[PDB]
Amino acid sequence: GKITLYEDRGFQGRHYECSSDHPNLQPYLSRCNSARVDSGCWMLYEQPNYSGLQYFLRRGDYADHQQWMGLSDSVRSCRLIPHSGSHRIRLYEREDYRGQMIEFTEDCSMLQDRFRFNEIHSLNVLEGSWVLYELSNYRGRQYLLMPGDYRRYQDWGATNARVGSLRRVIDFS
């Protein structure tokens, strides 16, 4: 799809349009305080090369970085998350796909209501892309998951295994 990132709030100031992954927005955008997501699902990153804090944006209007739960106006790379028509993920109690496992094909806002573990230590993203959230109801630190193996929580960019919720990356329109 396409996303337009603006240096000032309210879709004001200098801006830059992306249609694909961009690993270093720094020459083209000195800060980001609003965004318009016309189409697609996007992950914004605080640092270049898809690192630092992550923020999931779907289509729609974001007049402040707080509306994507952004903690600062730093946005220095972004990913266009490939569309998927189906979603399936396996979440594991322990590293390397060991221990008890819970499987999802739908969103889960309250992981601890379905799984009696505060942590997920590995997971397997069989179908579609997801966003994993530190806290229930899609809050806290966010980690983009794309199809593939995640043998350790460090493989999704986390410094611990805390998980409270997870959502499918779906374009709503």
Contact status, residue 73 vs residue 32, Cβ threshold 8 Å? yes
Residue spans of the domains in the chain: they are: 1-83, 84-173
**How many Cα atoms occupy the beta-carbon half-sphere of 59 within 13 Å?**
10
* C-beta atoms surrounding 96 within 10 Å: 11
Is-contact 89 123, C-beta < 8 A? Answer: yes
Mapping DSSP onto H, E and C, the string for the chain reads CEEEEEEECCCEEEEEEECCCECCCCCCCCCCCEEEEEECEEEEEEECCCEEEEEEECCEEECCHHHHCCCCCCCCEEEEECCCCCCEEEEECCHHHCCCEEEECCCECCHHHHCCCCECCEEEEEECCEEEEEECCCEEEEEEECCEEECCHHHHCCCCCECCEEEECCCCC
Distance between CA atoms of 105 and 9, rounded to whole angstroms?
Answer: 36
